[PDB]
């Protein structure tokens, strides 16, 4: 649940900023404080090796699946069934992917776009294991968090 995520962030001394989702007027009042780097999250699986892994890239990143597989593992990477994501990361249709990987210990690798750590954006935004809000936090503290969950990420650059 989200409470466990906030509890582990407080244990790691990571201060965040959460804007609660429920009309362009509310989104305009909340948009003024929301300014940073958003993301699109992919949960992929290798047919051959039968290992699930997680990819987090920028929201506007154009991406080819077979080319991404070629960078890591010929296109053998396919999208993973939502049942797998539900049983592995306790979420479904809510891709709170960096904030929900604290459950999987060694069965899900983490791929992160390099542009989240480089660039002039003060905070990055992800869901806190629910679609009813968005949590924003510093990219370096976010890297500290994802490394504290046992997932040494594999940073790769697209530019």
UniProtKB/Swiss-Prot annotation:
| Biological source species | Mus musculus (Mouse)
Q: What is the name attached to this protein's record?
A: Prolyl-tRNA synthetase associated domain-containing protein 1
The entry assigns this protein to a family as follows: Belongs to the PRORSD1 family.
- Name the InterPro entries for this protein: ProX/PRXD1 (IPR040285), YbaK/aa-tRNA-synt-asso_dom_sf (IPR036754), YbaK/aa-tRNA-synth-assoc-dom (IPR007214)
Supply the Pfam families for this chain.
tRNA_edit
Q: Which GO terms describe its molecular function?
A: aminoacyl-tRNA deacylase activity
């Amino acid at each position: 649940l989200r409470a466990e995520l906030e509890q582990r962030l407080g244990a790691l001394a990571i201060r965040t900023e959460v804007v609660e989702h429920p009309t362009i007027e509310e989104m305009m009042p909340h948009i003024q404080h929301l300014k940073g780097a958003h993301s699109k999250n992919l949960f992929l699986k290798d047919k051959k090796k039968k290992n699930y892994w997680l990819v987090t890239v920028l929201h506007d990143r154009q991406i080819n699946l077979n080319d991404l597989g070629k960078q890591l593992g010929s296109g053998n990477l396919r999208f993973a069934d939502e049942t797998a994501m539900l049983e592995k990361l306790k979420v479904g249709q809510g891709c709170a992917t960096p904030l929900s990987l604290f459950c999987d210990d060694g069965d899900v690798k983490f791929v992160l776009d390099s542009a989240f750590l480089e660039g002039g954006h003060e905070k990055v935004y992800f869901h806190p294991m629910t679609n009813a809000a968005t949590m924003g936090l510093s990219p370096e503290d976010f890297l500290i968090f994802v490394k504290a969950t046992g997932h040494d990420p594999i940073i790769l650059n697209f530019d």
